[PDB]
Amino acid sequence: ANYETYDGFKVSEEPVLPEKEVHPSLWFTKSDIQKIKEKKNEDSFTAELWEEISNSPYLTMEIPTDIPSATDSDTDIHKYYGNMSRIAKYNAFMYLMTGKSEYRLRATEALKRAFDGPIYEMDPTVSGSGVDEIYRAVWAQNFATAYDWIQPYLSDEDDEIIRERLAKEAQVVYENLYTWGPRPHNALSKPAWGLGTLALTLSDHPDASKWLNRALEAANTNTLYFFNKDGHYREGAHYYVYSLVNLIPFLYHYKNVSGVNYFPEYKNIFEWAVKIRNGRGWMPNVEDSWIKPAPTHMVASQYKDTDTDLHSTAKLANILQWSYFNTDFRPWEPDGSYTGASYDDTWDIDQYLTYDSTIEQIKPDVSGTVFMNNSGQTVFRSDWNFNNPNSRYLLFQGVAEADNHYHYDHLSFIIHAENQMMASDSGYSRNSYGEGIRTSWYLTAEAHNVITANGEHPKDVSENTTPVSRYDMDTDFFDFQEKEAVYDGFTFPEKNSYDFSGKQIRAIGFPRQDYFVVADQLFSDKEVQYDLYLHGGRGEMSGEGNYRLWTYEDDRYGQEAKMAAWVFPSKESIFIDKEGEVNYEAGAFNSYGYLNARQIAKDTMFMQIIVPLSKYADIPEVVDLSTDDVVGGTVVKDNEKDTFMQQLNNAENSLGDITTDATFAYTNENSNNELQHFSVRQGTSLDYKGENIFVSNKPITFALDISDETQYKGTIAALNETVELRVKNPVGVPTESVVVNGENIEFSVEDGYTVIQVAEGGDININFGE
Ligand SMILES: O=C(O)[C@H]1O[C@@H](O[C@H]2[C@H](O)[C@H](O)[C@H](O[C@H]3[C@H](O)[C@H](O)[C@H](O[C@H]4[C@H](O)[C@H](O)[C@H](O[C@H]5[C@H](O)[C@H](O)[C@H](O)O[C@@H]5C(=O)O)O[C@@H]4C(=O)O)O[C@@H]3C(=O)O)O[C@@H]2C(=O)O)[C@@H](O)[C@@H](O)[C@@H]1O
Ligand SMILES: [Ca+2]
Ligand SMILES: [Ca+2]
Ligand SMILES: [Mg+2]
Ligand SMILES: [Mn+2]
Helix, strand or coil: CCCCCCCCCCCCCCCCCCCCCCCCCCCCCHHHHHHHHHHHHCCHHHHHHHHHHCCCHHHHCCCCCCCCCCCCCHHHHHHHHHHHHHHHHHHHHHHHHHCCHHHHHHHHHHHHCCCCCCCCCCCCCCCCCCCCCCHHHHHHHHHHHHHHHHHHHCCHHHHHHHHHHHHHHHHHHHHHHHHHCCCCCHHHHHHHHHHHHHHHHCCCCCCHHHHHHHHHHHHHHHHHHCECCCCCECCCHHHHHHHHHHHHHHHHHHHHHHCCCCCCCCCHHHHHHHHHCCCCCEECCCCCCCCEECCHHHHHHHHCCCCCCCCCCCCHHHHHHHHHHCCCCHHHCCCCCCCCCCCCCCHHHHHHCCCCCCCCCCCCCCCCCEEECCCCEEEEECCCCCCCCCCEEEEEECCCCCCCCCCCCCCEEEEEECCEECCCCCCCCCCCCCCHHHHHHHCCHHHCCCEEECCECCEECCCCCCCEEEEEECCCCCCEEEEEEECCCECCCCCCCCCCCEEEEEEEECHHHCCEEEEEEEEECCCEEEEEEEECCCCEEECCCCEEEEEECCECCECCEEEEEEEECCCCCEEEEEEEECCCCCCCCCEEEEEEEEEEECCEEEEEEEEEECCCCCCCEEEECCCCCCEEEEEEECCEEEEEEECCCCCCEEECCEEECCCEEEEEECCCCCEEEEEEEEEEEEEECCEEEEEEEEEEEEEEECCCCCEEEEEECCCCCCEEEEEECCCCCCEEEEEECCCECCEEECCCEEEEEECCCEEEEEEECC
16 A cells, blocks of 8 residues: 555644743643633533533542553453543643642552553554553543643652653654554554654653654654545544544644644644534544544634635634534433543543633535535535534545545445435444454445446545546536546555456436435446445335335434435336445444345446435425436426436437437426426537527536526536537527626627637626516
């Protein structure tokens, strides 16, 4: 695996340390302490956070006089060092906050027994080790923080003892960082930031410059490979948050101690979370990942002067604050831990010290639809409303495979709508990474919403190269994008030769921002077996032929609802009911229906029509009109007739009322059976009921709303060269202006048609008189 070719990001590796150690200074200086004590009375959140911290059993539990030996169980060794680190930090904090004698004594004794017992005897490369690098990253930050807090109140003797313990662990971590995490995943990054905290806590110690330099070096191998510039993490939401437990603290530690502010550089990893969140503020169960909330509140304070694309006027800080608190947290009751470190973390404290009660929660006001083409994700999204059933969310997953915690999920999608999780990623596993069922099922292509050719999964052209995206179109009435993966390409484990050569070109469209169309073009050099899968998450599957209906109930993830799905073409394809596991969180796995549509062919097409519905909604009337060269049909939902059409060539053909040379075409009628909205992929004409709507001298991809006869408005996808578009005016009405990207462009009117040269794409308004 090549770890240096992915379009990630890295910061300065130059170690910056202050002239002289200051304690406290990691989170705050001496001056801040009475402000922090008072903080508990700002709002109901700071109140709850204080209620939790001040009643922590780590203040009242007996410091254990039972040091466990090397040959004890891996769990008990974990919890010993976890509890000790926790006893140190919780007590050290509560001494600052109350001044109670006991708390200083407990903190001091716990810090004096930091990394006592068998830790340095044992081997962390061993799998699941009680002292694995990932756990002693949290421990290191817990003890180092505890020290920074109690250091002033220590005898010259106790200071020198505790300094030598933290300074040992620091040297051990420095020496064995790359041995423990030989590949740059979260097992390298987490303990690296752990070292970073230690280096900054003991800034005077002679080795600190070397410690911090490696800490930043090792961290940068993670951000260069597993992170994208645009903020995507390739280990998925779960290991993103697991990474945050150690990163977020270090980010603050290095600012507060050395005046090195990395928050601008790490900005996009927090924006990302908000962009891929569903109706209830959950990050998706993609790659080795459960559903996860994004702790964006704990960094909001640093982005008060940061612009975002997510609001016209407001600053990122306000959106980051909005995102966290607009998250359903019921899937983590009554415990409340979503970090992945519930044996080690001090999340109540770290939230107390980071939360800023002065930041106004502001909902994004921009188009919900977002195209993050650099990583390869894309979200169709009707609105940003929290826990609204009228909301529609589709994640379109086309991300270059990484070498750790990977699932085969190219051109997969998931859907959130009617407040339920519908079309599904089958999720991480039953429970853990080392389970057979993860390799035999959960990570396999078939456990996802893909198309396999002879069982081979759609994959990257070349390693660390994001699947190409085309025809990005966002509007009020219809969004659209296509992604291209290949079958005979690059994946993990590495597989150099294939019996054939083929590719998938999956287009997704968002008709009436209400339901979805998934229109696949498939090309191959040989005849092969295309298998389309469609998992309906955790629903009772029913229905025969080309139609399936998943019915959901009030579960731990949403409300009573249903998803209806039709597959085209009906005749050339066969439909196979199958049963597979779907898991959104540890231990909560179950078997559910999933559809296997199958064709045997060389070059062919599929089309899925997928419709979220509320429990007792009428099932739309969906008619297949597919033939030899043309796949597509008609949907009659809420008294409007939508028509879809795909083909493999720019060849004049018909379906329903459409006639076009476009590889894809969409139409919306109103109650009165008049064309209102239409979109085309690389068309040069479209007739509806045999009435021409537009023509062009070259192939153009655009969507247009023609429901208002004073103004036609839509968008035109990116252009390679000047096109002469000609749109038909409403009968006997003159064109006044044409606006593309808020600038006028030159227009004539010939035979009832507005005529424009367009050399770049963007939002178009054709403005009409009377
Ligand atoms: O607090 C809670 O809510 C629950 O937390 C639970 O803790 C979980 C965490 O949430 C994470 O899932 C954490 O992630 C670990 C995971 O436990 C495993 O250790 C897994 O193991 C593999 C590594 O990821 C990595 O792939 C490694 O690769 C090797 C590979 O074999 C090969 O030889 C190659 O050449 O070398 C590499 C290498 O670099 O070493 O193999 C590891 C393996 O063991 O197979 O890694 C993840 C990770 O990425 O960090 O796991 C904990 C956990 O304890 O389970 C849990 O405590 C639960 O009880 C709580 O309720
Ligand atoms: Ca993947
Ligand atoms: Ca839109
Ligand atoms: Mg290890
Ligand atoms: Mn998966």
